DNA sequence: ACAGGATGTATTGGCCTTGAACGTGCCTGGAGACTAGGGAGTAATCCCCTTGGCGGTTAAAACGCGGGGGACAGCGCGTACGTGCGTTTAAGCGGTGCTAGAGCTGTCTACGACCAATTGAGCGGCCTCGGCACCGGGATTCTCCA
DNA sequence: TGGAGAATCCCGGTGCCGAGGCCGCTCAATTGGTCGTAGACAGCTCTAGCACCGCTTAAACGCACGTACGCGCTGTCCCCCGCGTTTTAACCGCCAAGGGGATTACTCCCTAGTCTCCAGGCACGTTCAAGGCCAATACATCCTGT
């Protein structure tokens, strides 16, 4: 199980010309797993703090600011939440 | 009258055996409040959480202290000069 | 403003805990900048915790977390 | 039908809720937040991915190597502050020599 | 009838309360029964370190009462507990008389 | 709830005629809390990365390992061991 | 073994660095520190493969060690 | 002693290649593990994540020392240096 | 080198307040005895992969020589920081009064966990062709001298 | 020296090997239905954070002087640098042989879940021995004229 299929179709939604090597996608693999573990560790503890058993949307907004250094953190809220308002409206 | 150095080594003496803080405490709670206006209007604050915050910073401060001595001592020099803090701070990181 | 508050002879007491014997003139307001990151940070993550907590109040235990976040763990307030 | 097609993402969704119900960090998981975590990573990813095309395009490549993911994030303040302490397999170092040296 | 899990262990620290805490922390899905009883031995033994040094230092300043200033000095004086506890600042503890050679009169 | 009592109980056993202030107390709970968590957390791992589902004893001696230094482990395996075998044999 | 790490590594070393001149005694010193870290690393690795019950190091392991000592390392898995 | 130097210093700041020889290290590995356990097998990639971990730090503290060698007015780098950076970093 | 001399500094002895240690109720949380389901401790097998040995080539390591650049010590000058006194400023301490907001309780609902079918998205192999690295071959460009 | 002589950059050829595309299959994601409990909201109580006032005195500020130190300059010498033989051993390709990593099936025993009982730990309400404080005083320490 990895993430190379995705990798690959946001490469050529940025890029729909250049290709990318095998060292390279693992470098990415290892990236999105470490950052998927920073966010959901940041999550967890949050609401562990609130004594809470749920982990909402609220919590990952939350650890996104908490993470994420200045303006990375505004564009990733902003995609976050368009995404969940056009999941909910759907 | 005592000679240049004396009395800097009777308050290292001094301040290295206590535990007291430093800083004032109402300029130091002015300040955290001030800088806080700029997240949140309307800001309560504990006393607790101001004592923790002074207790943090002093202990912060008082370390960067210790490794920019020891830059000054590298460069064969006594006196600590701006440089020297900022080659710590970047060696450490920061 | 009231990072002047901060005056002089506090950070030569705080550069005499640390062992310093001469210091130069520039110092202070290096020493003042400095001290201003370092609450900026802090302050802004514990503030981000007491908002999560929809609550108007900040308290220790935000300020315990934000340091621990920032790798520097505070013992004896909670 | 599938999640990922009613968020507008190319990240899978449900995978993502999978991992987050297998790795101990709650007891409950809402509906929203796997759509949240995907669009952050596929918004990372795609900046990543669009400064290293950049600097693979900048010499006469078409194709990315860990080199070229190096000098994206070295040369980028947000993302060198997030991955500092993290070390990149054969992305050596940025070329800087110091003055007085010369 | 009943007996505590501690005393079942020979231990002063609550293997009950350490179950509990293993269980609601979100940590695994089943716990074992001997894990509360290796973690809480391994906690009252760095306990007891740390107390002995402490009321060594305590009874060097001619004092029957532990305060902040002796437990900084007993971890800052012995070479392993200021590695574990290497980032970590302790409230009222100040420093370690400590002055540089050069800095001396000659 | 904290852990007073117990830390009251360990110093009148090694310190027989030795009190103990209350901000001093409050640095124990910490250091307690702290190290607790830093084990739990690492026997979680390390149960994560074999596929496993139970934290054993087994977790707890690695963590503790993993953590102390030099001969703070070698002791605290000894104790946790002993602790063990008396739990069982009783 | 430790002298496998010859001069000529420990000068290209320097060079990407940055560094212009280099002084007699740096190659012992050099030596040393690695071989510090070298025994943390591995220590911490071995003590993951003993868990587990194998007999073979794997690479996951060193990962998981270079992540418990703050030096995450990408590309290996 | 300036040209070939500089020269060296932009060869090696372009390059990705690692600048240890590779049965060497295995060597290295192997008797640093025999104080641990005994008998033990390596992968093939295990010991190639220990050298470039162990490359990557080491030129991470050769530019430290580069720095401090440089706050004492020198262009010369000495145990010196390569001692206050260690002291600094925490190590 | 040494001997007064003013100064900081380590000794007692006596009061003397608060906080540390103790004793009581009582209310949860820990313990005891069953029951039932699946996690993991054991065997057994297949085949990947690790280790070991060997011959040849050649790129890299070692060794020695000769000379210049850089580290380090000594000296002089002048700026600026330590020391001590007299003058302003605001931190600290109580007391009072006032809400804003944090913590707890009760009830009702909608959201998330299970569970059983079902079908297509995503690894896994198998090809196939161009990016790229390499390989000469001129063309162009930095360092040092009459 | 603005003339040489290597270093580097720019040109095509090329070929090879690794990325990218295509097809068969299985397992994890989607859907529909139900339920029970976690989170949301309203009403209530009362603690604690904020604000003002006046006095007192401990720090903060300011000022002038003289000294120790930062910084630049110069000289010596020795130790790193560069370069040309020899000599060593890393690297590559090939073959050979088990160790042990990785799955799979069967079975037992260990951990979760429930109900009942009961004692250990927590919140309050006195008290009397630590430790901080104040004069009073004999030593240890710094600086300087001789």
Same mark, same amino acid.
């Given at each position: 199980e990895s993430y190379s299929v995705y990798v690959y179709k946001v490469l050529k939604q940025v890029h729909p010309d250049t290709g990318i090597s095998s060292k390279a996608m693992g470098i990415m693999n290892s990236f999105v797993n470490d950052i998927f573990e920073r966010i959901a560790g940041e999550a967890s503890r949050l609401a562990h703090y609130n004594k809470r058993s749920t982990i909402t949307s609220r919590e990952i907004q939350t650890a996104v600011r908490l993470l994420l250094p200045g303006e990375l953190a505004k564009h990733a809220v902003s995609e976050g939440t368009k995404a969940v308002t056009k999941y909910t409206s759907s | 009258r005592y000679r240049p150095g004396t009395v800097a080594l009777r308050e290292i003496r001094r301040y290295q055996k206590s535990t007291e803080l430093?800083?004032?405490?109402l300029p130091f709670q002015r300040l955290v409040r001030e800088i806080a206006q700029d997240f949140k209007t309307d800001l309560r604050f504990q006393s607790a959480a101001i004592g923790a915050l002074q207790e943090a910073s002093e202990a912060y401060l008082v370390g960067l202290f210790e490794d920019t001595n020891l830059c000054a001592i590298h460069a064969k020099r006594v006196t600590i000069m701006p440089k020297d803090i900022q080659l710590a701070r970047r060696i450490r990181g920061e | 403003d009231n990072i002047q508050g901060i005056t002089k002879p506090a950070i030569r007491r705080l550069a005499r805990r640390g062992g310093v014997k001469r210091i130069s003139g520039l110092i202070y307001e290096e020493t003042r900048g400095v001290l201003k990151v370092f609450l900026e940070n802090v302050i802004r993550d514990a503030v981000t915790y007491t908002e999560h907590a929809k609550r108007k109040t900040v308290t220790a235990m935000d300020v315990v977390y934000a340091l621990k976040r920032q790798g520097r763990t505070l013992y004896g307030f909670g | 039908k599938t999640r990922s097609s009613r968020a507008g993402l190319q990240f899978p969704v449900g995978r993502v809720h999978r991992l987050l119900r297998k790795? !101990?960090?709650?007891e409950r998981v809402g509906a929203g937040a796997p759509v949240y975590l995907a669009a952050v990573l596929e918004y990372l990813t795609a900046e990543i991915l669009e400064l290293a095309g950049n600097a693979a395009r900048? !010499? +006469? +490549?078409?194709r990315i190597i860990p080199r070229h993911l190096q000098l994206a994030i070295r040369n980028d303040e947000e993302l060198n502050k997030l991955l500092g302490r993290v070390t990149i397999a054969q992305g050596g170092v940025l070329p800087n020599i110091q003055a007085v040296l010369l």
């Amino acid at each position: 199980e990895s993430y190379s299929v995705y990798v690959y179709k946001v490469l050529k939604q940025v890029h729909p010309d250049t290709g990318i090597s095998s060292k390279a996608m693992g470098i990415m693999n290892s990236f999105v797993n470490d950052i998927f573990e920073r966010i959901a560790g940041e999550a967890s503890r949050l609401a562990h703090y609130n004594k809470r058993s749920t982990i909402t949307s609220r919590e990952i907004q939350t650890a996104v600011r908490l993470l994420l250094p200045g303006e990375l953190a505004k564009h990733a809220v902003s995609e976050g939440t368009k995404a969940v308002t056009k999941y909910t409206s759907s | 009258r005592y000679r240049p150095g004396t009395v800097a080594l009777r308050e290292i003496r001094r301040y290295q055996k206590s535990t007291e803080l430093l800083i004032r405490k109402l300029p130091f709670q002015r300040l955290v409040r001030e800088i806080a206006q700029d997240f949140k209007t309307d800001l309560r604050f504990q006393s607790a959480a101001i004592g923790a915050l002074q207790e943090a910073s002093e202990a912060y401060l008082v370390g960067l202290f210790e490794d920019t001595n020891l830059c000054a001592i590298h460069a064969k020099r006594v006196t600590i000069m701006p440089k020297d803090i900022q080659l710590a701070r970047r060696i450490r990181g920061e | 403003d009231n990072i002047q508050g901060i005056t002089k002879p506090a950070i030569r007491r705080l550069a005499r805990r640390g062992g310093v014997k001469r210091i130069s003139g520039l110092i202070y307001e290096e020493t003042r900048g400095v001290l201003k990151v370092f609450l900026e940070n802090v302050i802004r993550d514990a503030v981000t915790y007491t908002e999560h907590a929809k609550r108007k109040t900040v308290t220790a235990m935000d300020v315990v977390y934000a340091l621990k976040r920032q790798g520097r763990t505070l013992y004896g307030f909670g | 039908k599938t999640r990922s097609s009613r968020a507008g993402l190319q990240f899978p969704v449900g995978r993502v809720h999978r991992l987050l119900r297998k790795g !101990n960090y709650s007891e409950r998981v809402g509906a929203g937040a796997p759509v949240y975590l995907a669009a952050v990573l596929e918004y990372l990813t795609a900046e990543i991915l669009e400064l290293a095309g950049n600097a693979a395009r900048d !010499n +006469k +490549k078409t194709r990315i190597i860990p080199r070229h993911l190096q000098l994206a994030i070295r040369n980028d303040e947000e993302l060198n502050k997030l991955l500092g302490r993290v070390t990149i397999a054969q992305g050596g170092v940025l070329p800087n020599i110091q003055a007085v040296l010369l």
